[PDB]
């Protein structure tokens with residue numbers, strides 16, 4: 001199993017604000033969709049609520065501690081370990097957030113597909129800091145703007 005973390009962040013690793021995105025970057029949404037199609041996607045309960053409904057054509061997996069919580073079109077697991085344990089036969093598992101899930105997944109992450117925006121936004125939640133010595137850059141594609149801010153597609157392997 002390859003554990004992959006996919007997230008869009010700014011220059012200071014900001015990811016959210018009032019349970020929403022602080023930006024809208026169409027290029028990232030298409031990138032995200034192609035990368036995640038046909039794979040299991042693991043998310044926190046707040047991140048699901050942020051989306052509002054299951055992402056189509058994908059096995060949506062939601063992590064929560066609420067034991068009686070039912071979510072149509074999603075598989076519920078009561079810890080990240082239980083989810084990963086259930087997805088043992090899967091060749092790849094994609095962790096999509098949020099901040100708490102990323103922090104717990106980071107030490108077990110094999111791969112990271114990060115969108116880094118060249119801008120400084122206002123927000124409250126951040127992507128966890130990773131040790132640059134443990135990760136190597138496998139792909140880096142920078143884009144200028146049209147997507148009103150500059151961004152890059154950074155792919156890291158541990």
Ligand SMILES: NC(=O)C1=CN([C@@H]2O[C@H](COP(=O)(O)OP(=O)(O)OC[C@H]3O[C@@H](n4cnc5c(N)ncnc54)[C@H](OP(=O)(O)O)[C@@H]3O)[C@@H](O)[C@H]2O)C=CC1
Nearest residue numbers: 007008016019020021044045046047064065097098099100
């Ligand atoms: N830029 C990007 O790519 C992304 C940005 N975001 C942003 O991040 C924010 C949401 O993230 P965040 O606020 O950190 O919330 P999370 O999405 O991390 O979800 C938190 C909730 O998930 C459950 N949970 C998390 N970890 C565990 C665990 N180890 N065991 C059991 N349950 C767990 C809990 O649910 P419960 O309370 O029900 O027990 C908890 O309250 C939003 O603003 C969103 O816009 C999110 C994803 C991607």
